[PDB]
């Protein structure tokens, strides 16, 4: 229906798979950066491999006008132009900056269909870097990590673990994301005090709790035992939605029924109304890293990781497949606003009161498109 609805369902489908392997842990990731990397793989995939991807991410509006790179990139009504437009709209400033840089590291003179590199540069603005995998995979890895590290101001290091790439690696797709946004209604340093954050219904922990009073849109879901708070960013184009369950442990129930429908339903007009209220929100600092291979495989995307994978749209020369896929993300939420840095990567080898003192879910979205940029679960500030 739109990149917005698509980013939403994909976000939730990913969550339903992650929460199972990270129970009682914080969870934080960037849906947008993940669909972006997945889009660049999809560009050069055909047959079932290709069809299987779209059936799980649901970001390419059918019908399709051909797997031709010229077609896809010269269609004007597809996933690539949809994803491209959204990135253009949210990319920078003054009170908020957002950037997503992509890069393709490929072997010395490898049969990478010329048009593939052309389009990726065109639509995803990705630069091509010539790297020596065959005889210097050791150096290639450190060059790549070094680039990701610098794009994230040193926050995301060694995105690629030892021998995650070798002499059989043909290409590495990787992106870096940086988001810095000022709250429209900031918090005062002075009003920030220590306070108990009730993890389990029987276990607390001291955390710097930010506080302020003011007008904010809220919605009471007394029938789901939860409330939703919207904290707009100063840009006026983005906001953070905070879903807080009423009971100290009602989170395990909320994570079961939540989805695009409900969220859209709970964030409606006749549901949320402006009110003057007290808001307590803890300063948060999250650092997470995930292996997407298992996640995507569980979600239904399997051929891209198999021997029977078709990425001929990237190279007719040798048979290829995705070796590994990773996603790292770091977020900080304080008085002035929020900061997020991240990276999605994939290797292609030769084949009246609102106090949040208990666990809550949150997500940052683009107001006009309902596109979800960040999603997270906060169990430990």
Swiss-Prot record:
The modification N-acetylglycine is found at residue 1. Its main location: secreted. Residues 21-47 form the signal peptide. The keyword Glycoprotein applies. It comes from the Eukaryota. Major protein of egg white. Expressed in the magnum of the oviduct (at protein level). Ca(2+) binds at residue 190. One of its GO terms (molecular function) is calcium ion binding. The record marks 354-355 as: Cleavage. SMART domains: SERPIN. Coiled coil: none annotated. Changing residue 119 to A: Lower thermal denaturation temperature, more susceptible to elastase or subtilisin cleavage and assumes a native-like conformation on alkaline treatment. Keywords: Acetylation, Allergen, Calcium, Disulfide bond, Glycoprotein, Metal-binding, Phosphoprotein, Secreted, Signal. Glycans are attached at residue 291. Induction: Down-regulated by dietary stress. Decreased expression at day 14 in the magnum of the oviduct in the corticosterone-fed laying hens. Homodimer. The uncleaved signal peptide becomes available for membrane translocation of ovalbumin when the nascent chain is 50 to 60 residues long. The hydrophobic sequence, which lies between residues 27 and 43, folds back on the preceding residues to form an amphipathic hairpin structure which is the signal element recognized by the membrane. Unlike other serpins, after protease cleavage at the P-P' site, ovalbumin does not have the ability to undergo the conformational transition into the loop-inserted reactive-center-containing thermostabilized form. Non-inhibitory serpin. Storage protein of egg white. This is Ovalbumin.
